[PDB]
Amino acid sequence: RTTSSFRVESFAICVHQLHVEKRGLTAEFVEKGDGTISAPATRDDWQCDVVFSLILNTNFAQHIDQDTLVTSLPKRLARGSAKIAIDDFKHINSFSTLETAIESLPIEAGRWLSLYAQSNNNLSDLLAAMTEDHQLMASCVGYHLLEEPKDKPNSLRGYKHAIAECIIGLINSITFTDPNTIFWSLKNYQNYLVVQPR
RNA sequence: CUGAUAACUUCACGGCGGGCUUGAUGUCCGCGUCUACCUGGUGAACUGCCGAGUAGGUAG
Secondary structure (H helix, E strand, O other): OOOOOOOOOOEEEEEEEEEEEEOOOOOOOOEOOOOOEOOOOOOOOEEEEEEEEEEEOOOOOOOOOOOOOHHHOOOEEOOEEOOOOOOOHHHOOOOOOOOOOHHHOOOOOOOEEEEOOOOOOOOHHHHOOOOOOOOOEOOOOEEEEOOOOEOOOOOOOOOOEOOEEEEOOOEEEEOOOOOOOOOEEEEEOOOEEEEEOO
16 A cells, blocks of 8 residues: 555465365355255365465565554455464564574474476376375466457456466475575466466 | 355264183302592680689679
8 A cells, every 4th residue: 555665576385284174165045046045056175274374575675564564464365264363463573584584483383385396297106206205285386278368248357368277286395495495476478377486 | 366255064872791811840150450649727716703613604
């Protein structure tokens, strides 16, 4: 709003805790079309409780506020509810070098996120790539497009509607030192979109 | 601008009955710990009287 130079431009992620299990999801009896009110079809759902800390690399020189840092952060992360405890607002700050940021996290378990940039052009060279440490993850990394793009009326906000598919790259972990094997950033290559570590 | 926005799974529930693990059994022989060795009070809390009094009171 005020400082339109903020430009986070990169981000490092540190997953401190991850638990995944089956819960399902109850919808709310929407109309089937003629006159009858009943629940829609039944789907089965995996979901997770994620505890993590971020360190952003912005371009603005100092902090913002503490009245107006907390009311500037969204409450949503991949349909979840993502929040910070209100007796923990003191550790939000802007340091000026990386190595002084690591001892100001009062959480202390790591697994910073990079990727595995080796030839994995099928599935069999993934399952032959997993059982050595097997704390390893295969997340979503980007979108390989299909269409050009083009445009047609009922888009989100008048923008141009392409059609795409997902990318199933591998995610590894770092005990932690060079800050460019970390610090993901989004790049466009005119045929796909991938978050790359710069 | 997050495969976007929204999304109460729940009610009841007696695993019980019975059961002999035992018999026998030689661990022993031999064996040199020794040599050497300064904890110091600088001078430093005196001289008397009474009490039959290693106890007890005095004056300076």
